[PDB]
Amino acid sequence: GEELFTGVVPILVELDGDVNGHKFSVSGEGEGDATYGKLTLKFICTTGKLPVPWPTLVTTLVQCFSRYPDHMKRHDFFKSAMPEGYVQERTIFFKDDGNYKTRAEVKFEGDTLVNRIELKGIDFKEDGNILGHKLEYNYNSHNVYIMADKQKNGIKVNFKIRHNIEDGSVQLADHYQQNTPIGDGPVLLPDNHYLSTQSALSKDPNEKRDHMVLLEFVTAAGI
């Protein structure tokens, strides 16, 4: 897959979610430039108002677009699984609140890199920081820790996202991730390393639908 990410690739994102019964759908389009670990996307809630804060959806809403330096190419599982793609599953535990469980398939459909997602959220407090919409519209920089999972011929991923709360406090979201290939072809199983992330959220001053504009940079490191 390395060769498939040398230039600007277009991206399409589709998420179907249900959090405590509140059903919703999100669509997103943009492009990724893995050579600069760059992502520019704009997401729309296609069913109306989003029943959770936009930032809680950022991790769910294409790590194959992370910049893997030359001396780490042999560790880029994400791109190695292309174009057949890979399944990405997660369990996001929101401290003192509910948890999201997600399953997605990211692969190529012609030239378009597609991320199809199903998200299920349960045990949220209808009046907590998530359902009550008390998280600020911003995003911090984190370190995504990656590990090989030889027995599953995939990887294991763990990290902690810190969502700023409107009162100055912090809402922790423990991420437990698993990625496995969709094809029966070989993939790169990586030594331990991590991805350094940063995201900036903004609004489109001409968009009336509930939405999020995301600019994100990610680069592999730790080796």
Numbering used by the authors: 4 to 64, 68 to 229
Give excerpts from the publication.
Enhanced green fluorescent protein (EGFP) is the Phe64Leu/Ser65Thr mutant of GFP and one of the most widely used autofluorescent tags in molecular and cell biology. GFPs are frequently used as reporters for both in vitro and in vivo protein folding, but their (re)folding rates are known to be very slow (10–1000 s). GFPs contain ten proline residues in their primary sequence. These prolines affect the folding rates in a decisive manner because of their known slow cis/trans isomerization.
In (4S)-FPro-EGFP all 10 Pro residues were replaced by (4S)-FPro (theoretical mass: 27924.5 Da; found mass: 27923.9±3.0 Da). This was further evidenced by the X-ray structure analysis of (4S)-FPro-EGFP. Surprisingly, (4S)-FPro-EGFP exhibited superior refolding properties when compared to the parent EGFP as the rate is 2.1 times faster than that of the parent EGFP in both phases. All (4S)-FPro residues display Cγ-endo puckered pyrrolidine rings apart from Pro56, which adopts a Cγ-exo configuration. Indeed, the fluoroprolines are well defined and characterized by low B-factors indicating rigid local conformations in the protein matrix. Apparently, such spatial display with preferred Cγ-endo puckering of 9 out of 10 Pro residues dramatically improves the folding properties. Indeed, 12 new interactions were detected in the (4S)-FPro-EGFP structure that were not present in EGFP. The majority of the fluorine atoms in (4S)-FPro-EGFP is involved in interactions with hydrogen atoms from neighboring backbone -NH- groups on their ‘own’ strand or on strands in the near vicinity. (4S)-FPro56 is the only fluoroproline having a Cγ-exo pucker. This puckering directs the (4S)-fluorine atom towards an unfavorable position as it is involved in a repulsive interaction (3.07 Å) with the backbone carbonyl group of Asn153 on the neighboring strand.
